[PDB]
Amino acid sequence: QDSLSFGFPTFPSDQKNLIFQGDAQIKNNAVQLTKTDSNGNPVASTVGRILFSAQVHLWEKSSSRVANFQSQFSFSLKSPLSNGADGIAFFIAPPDTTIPSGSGGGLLGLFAPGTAQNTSANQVIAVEFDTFAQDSNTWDPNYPHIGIDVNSIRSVKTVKWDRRDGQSLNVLVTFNPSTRNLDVVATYSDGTRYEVSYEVDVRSVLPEWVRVGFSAASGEQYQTHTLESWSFTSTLLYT
Amino acid sequence: QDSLSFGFPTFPSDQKNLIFQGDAQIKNNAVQLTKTDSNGNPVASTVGRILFSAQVHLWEKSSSRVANFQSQFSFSLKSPLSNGADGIAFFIAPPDTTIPSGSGGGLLGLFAPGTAQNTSANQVIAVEFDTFYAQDSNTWDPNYPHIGIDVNSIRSVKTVKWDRRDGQSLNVLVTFNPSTRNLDVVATYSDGTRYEVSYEVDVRSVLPEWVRVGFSAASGEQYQTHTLESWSFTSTLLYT
Numbered sequence A: 001q002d003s004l005s006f007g008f009p010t011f012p013s014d015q016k017n018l019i020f021q022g023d024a025q026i027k028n029n030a031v032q033l034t035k036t037d038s039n040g041n042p043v044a045s046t047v048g049r050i051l052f053s054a055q056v057h058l059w060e061k062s063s064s065r066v067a068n069f070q071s072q073f074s075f076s077l078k079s080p081l082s083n084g085a086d087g088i089a090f091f092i093a094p095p096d097t098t099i100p101s102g103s104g105g106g107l108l109g110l111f112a113p114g115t116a117q118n119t120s121a122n123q124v125i126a127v128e129f130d131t132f133a134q135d136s137n138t139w140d141p142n143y144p145h146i147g148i149d150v151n152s153i154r155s156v157k158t159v160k161w162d163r164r165d166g167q168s169l170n171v172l173v174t175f176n177p178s179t180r181n182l183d184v185v186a187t188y189s190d191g192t193r194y195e196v197s198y199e200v201d202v203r204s205v206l207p208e209w210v211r212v213g214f215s216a217a218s219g220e221q222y223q224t225h226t227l228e229s230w231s232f233t234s235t236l237l238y239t
Numbered sequence B: 001q002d003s004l005s006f007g008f009p010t011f012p013s014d015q016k017n018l019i020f021q022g023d024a025q026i027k028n029n030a031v032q033l034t035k036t037d038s039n040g041n042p043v044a045s046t047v048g049r050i051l052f053s054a055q056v057h058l059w060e061k062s063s064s065r066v067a068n069f070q071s072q073f074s075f076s077l078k079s080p081l082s083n084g085a086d087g088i089a090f091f092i093a094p095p096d097t098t099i100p101s102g103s104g105g106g107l108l109g110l111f112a113p114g115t116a117q118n119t120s121a122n123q124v125i126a127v128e129f130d131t132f133y134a135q136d137s138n139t140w141d142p143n144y145p146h147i148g149i150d151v152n153s154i155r156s157v158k159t160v161k162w163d164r165r166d167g168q169s170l171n172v173l174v175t176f177n178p179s180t181r182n183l184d185v186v187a188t189y190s191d192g193t194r195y196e197v198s199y200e201v202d203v204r205s206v207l208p209e210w211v212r213v214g215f216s217a218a219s220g221e222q223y224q225t226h227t228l229e230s231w232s233f234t235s236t237l238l239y240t
Ligand SMILES: OC[C@H]1O[C@H](O)[C@@H](O)[C@@H](O)[C@@H]1O
Pocket: B085, B086, B104, B105, B106, B107, B132, B134, B137, B138, B219, B220, B221, B222, B223
């Protein structure tokens, strides 16, 4: 299809179009990307991802068209620790994507250790919300941030962000094929706003058909990564 | 998802979200539901169906919600002879639905010969466009071309006389309103000729909560092409 859209105002347990990977599962009308104990508390060493089943037609060679898409979602992070980790990300990748071997912790379940920083060994665009160390994650700034990843865990750009325990963050990620701008706008309920944009030609990074979803992980330090709602729309346009 | 929508202005050969059953295949940016030869002409004894891969949440027990949906599509029928068979249908059925054994010809690839008229043995809502075309092989339904609404039976609960026009595209709009429980069908040719048929039906008592939607077509001894040219669909769960 040239156009596709779906909306999950909430996530009831009865799902049919979601692909669950790792420890991801539905609990309390929300998606818990990372594992939580029986009491609902986060645990260490966990990775989880979800993908929408239907493939998205991102671009089409024959017609020289590229999709204009919008992804709106909200999530909350919670942890009894002073340093909850590691983060959650919205990502776009090839349809057969699976969790890479040893991609826990700072790799967010998105990249394999051996090629995490090799743009030629990866095909993925992701928007990450990182809450976690200059000794391990020697590739990220010295503070929580929102980062745009293009075939590498080493963000092409980042902006400072504040982690607020248990508070929902509303995010809108849009891509405009005419300007090739990928824009990210995130807000907390009190109006605090964060914005970051990057110009990228998706045709040179991703295949024509892709899948979209979310990934999260916790290493030694942990926190819940709760996806509360998600709406997505994409339509092929002439450029 | 509470809401889902997709649109196929045309059908390129590179499809990823369509389930092809029987002889259905993409050809010339359109879906040929029934088999065609090298010249592109219709052949006999052929059945084909397509379904969208994502499941549609038609209703939700826990919340007491039922979906409002709309399906818009266009198709054309062509045959070397002045008339053709057997017809095409838009249908809604359980996710694992497959072509019933021996459901060719007049059964449109939707029902099994043994229970084609047994409502308790079927779970399907379909809007068919019948053009044959044969009281000898299709004793059911009125004796003239028609559009019919099928609910668990090949014997339409409601029909309206229809005109077959070789090679001309018919634009169809199928809508279901959970508030009135009316399933409305409006079909029109480019010159403005319009056909309307509707029926009240509680989808909850007929189909499971999650379903798949698609099209089916068949040709027995008599044949014609059943070309699906475009299709857009959209559903949203609403409180009743
Ligand atoms: O195709 C016309 C006609 O051919 C045969 O008689 C059978 O397959 C019928 O079901 C069908 O209606």
